[PDB]
Amino acid sequence: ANIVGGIEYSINNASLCSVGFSVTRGATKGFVTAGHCGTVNATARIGGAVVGTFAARVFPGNDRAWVSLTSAQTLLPRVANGSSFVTVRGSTEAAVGAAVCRSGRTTGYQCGTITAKNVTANYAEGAVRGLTQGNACMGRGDSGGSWITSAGQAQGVASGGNVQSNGNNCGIPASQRSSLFERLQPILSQYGLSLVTG
Template sequence: MALITAVLTVPSADAATGQPPDPPSATLAAQRAEEIRTTLGGEEAGSYYDAENRKLVVNVTSEAAAAKVRAAGAQARIVKHSLASLDAARATLKEQAAIPGTSWAMDPRINKVVVVADPTVKGKHLDRLTTATASLGERVTLSHSPHELRPVIAGGDAIWGSQARCSLGFNVVKDGQPYVLTAGHCAKAVQRWSEQMGGSEIAVTENHKFPGADFGLAKYTAADVVHPSAVNLYSSQGKHSSGGDDGGGGSGGGGGGGNMQTITKAADPIVGQKVRRSGSTTHVRDGEVTALNVTANYQEGPVEGLIQTTVCAEPGDSGGPLFDGDTALGLTSGGRGSCSQKGETFYQPVRAALEKTGAKLG
């Protein structure tokens, strides 16, 4: 009987003050950040998790808002640019500089929108990008990457189609039936999936969204396939950093047969959260969330609302899971660089994918 697991190609306050304790985990910090945000109106400017000190940091633009943050048990940081102002800068970039090979994200730790251009952005396109970013003043910073921005499709357990190899993201259930949730650019390229190259069919793509977003759903068709809500940890290869060599990267491998991480829930991450990714090419890698609501302008078209991390990935890791313990966070979409070049990656948030497909973990 085949076994297909999900793999993806995340101090107390002084009692005398009456404040609640600081969040003990990044997951709880993300939940508290959303609760605090609703009380701040237009004076909120993003938030992040200080993992070293286990502190939720909330950016605000006034002392009055800072007092609200402190009363809620988080650390307040007064900054210059409001979230509305930074969002307006992002809107201008979308209108004037949606150039393939670029990405942008609001970085709450520096209170700016960070724009990155890859080597394909040159000539008149680079001139247009430079003009657009300069017009936004100190709200935006422009940098250049030597690595091309791309979806990481190729060829986590590996799932194969005639046109591609990707990684299974999460096993899910829809209308009582088992499905595979993976990257949309994978599902767009492949109609019928198998466990190995040229193998028998195990699932058929039902729908996908790419570009715009990056998620796809394939229905299991093989009765002998067991599909637990778990991620393949590839035995002991679960503690390697994004830049390290796990001895299994680039193998183009199939199912791992290693340890499993049970997945019980889905959540949205927070900047600063430590996360892990599993994929059929580079297996398990770890890193940190660096931005949310990211726009990646792939050559195939823009994808918005992504999670950005310091985790590396390579072709074939697409679709695989981003997770933190038993919590599902995202699906590998694309990135720059590789695991030997200090790469960075982007992920489709899994909660949004579940909501839009009508599926649930299971």
């Protein structure tokens, strides 16, 4: 499978999540995603084929994970935007007020702005600290998906938000949306990963 930010993958033939970013760890290929998407060793599938398993994760507390893929996967420095792509150029962290977009299997490609940093989400499982808040909308299934600037700087992976009864926060005004992502920097250093760029 071609690994692109934003595409769907399933975990143990049950839940669905979205790919974050293609990364490498020495010769091993992988992608970063959300911790709440699977437990260590869960099996990730892309279009019905096995692509890898969860190598590590932290959830709750943080919300992060990396899946190590088999050798046959093709890692790409891109994030889906409809039929087009956003090239990943790096991981400079943008500041409050910067515009940002996110890509995921449920709501596609949505943009908005970063409204706050260091936010805590109280999930049923426990608190998740240090999240950055943006107002791009997100829906159930978007978790783990890419958060990136139009200029190609990777910001993080989708964690959660105030989804309404329709499964998303796209039907409420930007001013009332709280869509949270986990910062990419600490995931890259914690696992010793390098981003695939182009």
